[PDB]
């Protein structure tokens, strides 16, 4: 029962990656773990329908 990460954070903290330059979502848990830049994009949640 050992929690870890994966994906872009997983390749980041393993040293396989060094900086995520991407539309990466700013949240609370990652700021407890990594640092963030100042945000470039500001947008909210919405619902795509047909």
């Amino acid at each position: 029962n050992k929690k870890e990460w994966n994906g872009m954070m997983g390749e980041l903290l393993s040293g396989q990656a060094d900086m995520i330059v991407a539309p990466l979502t700013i949240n609370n848990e990652r700021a407890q773990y990594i640092e963030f830049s100042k945000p470039f994009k500001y947008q909210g949640l919405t619902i795509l329908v047909k």
Binding site: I26, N27, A31
Partner: protein
């Protein structure tokens, strides 16, 4: 000076009150994560007729055909037919097939004008949100002499928005030098009393006063599309150990919508007349076309 002079010279630790964030403020001291999307803004104040024409020619041709079967309404069936389209009491058909066909045509005209009333009711549904100026890229925003009224704009005095103007366009700062003002509510009055034409400010207070304006006669441009697109935050001194904790607290305040709850608590989501002058202008254009057709027929 001000809050920056209090923070940098360390008589005040931080400033919880609302403040724009820009470059050299971030150079001298530190900032938290943003909490509200606050950019800037500017407060200101046929084929159906063709196919029915074709079917009208079909009906007139079959009326001529019934006349050829079996006393002067040969080509005059078009005028009386298109008059019974509009039910004008036109100053009598005799052929049975002609009466049935003209009746089906007239019933088609009745249900088509009923569908035109449906078009009018759908036009009654449509509520418009007109926009005179649609962004900072307006050609009004180069020279007030380029258009026929020389308008007036302006910002708050000694503001960071003025610094953004001076780093964007010092010529715009020179036009604003002749167009300065003092008070925010005084600028509101000058917009209401015609002393001012437009105002440039962040979307926060402008949307807040949009939720409390008496009449909503002053609307900004859009919702922050082609604008400065920055945020508000909390300025902190460089080296503050409180910074990470304040950032995590702001993220937790976002993550439950309690920030959104306080936005809803401190904002207000607010905002007969016959009008036909577009269709009346079409009426004038078509009567000009009718007198042009009379001018065509005036060759005899």
């Amino acid at each position: 000076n001000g809050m920056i002079g209090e923070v940098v010279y360390q008589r005040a630790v931080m400033a919880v009150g609302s403040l724009t964030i820009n470059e050299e403020r971030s150079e001298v001291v530190d900032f938290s994560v943003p909490f509200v999307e606050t950019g800037i803004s500017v407060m200101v104040s046929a084929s159906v007729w063709v196919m029915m024409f074709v079917m009208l020619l079909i009906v007139s041709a079959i009326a001529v055909f019934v006349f050829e079967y079996f006393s002067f309404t040969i080509g005059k069936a078009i005028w009386l037919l298109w008059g019974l389209v509009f039910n004008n009491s036109v100053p009598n058909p005799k052929g049975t097939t002609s009466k049935i066909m003209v009746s089906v045509w007239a019933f088609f005209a009745v249900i088509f004008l009923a569908s035109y009333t449906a078009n009018l009711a759908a036009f009654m549904i449509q509520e418009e949100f007109v926009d005179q100026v649609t962004g900072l890229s307006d050609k009004k925003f180069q020279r007030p002499h380029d258009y026929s009224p020389p308008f007036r704009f302006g910002t708050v005095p000694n503001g960071s928005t003025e610094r953004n103007i001076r780093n964007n366009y010092p010529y715009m700062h020179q036009y604003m030098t002749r167009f300065n003002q003092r008070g925010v509510e005084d600028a509101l009055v000058s917009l209401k009393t015609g002393k001012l034409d437009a105002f440039i400010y962040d979307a926060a207070v402008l949307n807040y006063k949009a939720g409390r304006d008496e009449g909503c006669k002053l609307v900004t441009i859009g919702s922050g599309y082609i604008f400065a697109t920055t945020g508000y935050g909390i300025a902190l001194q460089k080296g503050s150990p409180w910074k990470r904790q304040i950032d995590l607290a702001l993220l937790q305040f976002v993550g439950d919508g309690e920030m959104e709850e306080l936005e809803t608590l401190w904002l207000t989501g607010i905002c007969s007349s016959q009008l036909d002058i577009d269709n009346m202008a079409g009426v004038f254009y078509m009567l000009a076309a009718a007198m042009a057709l009379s001018l065509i027929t005036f060759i005899w």
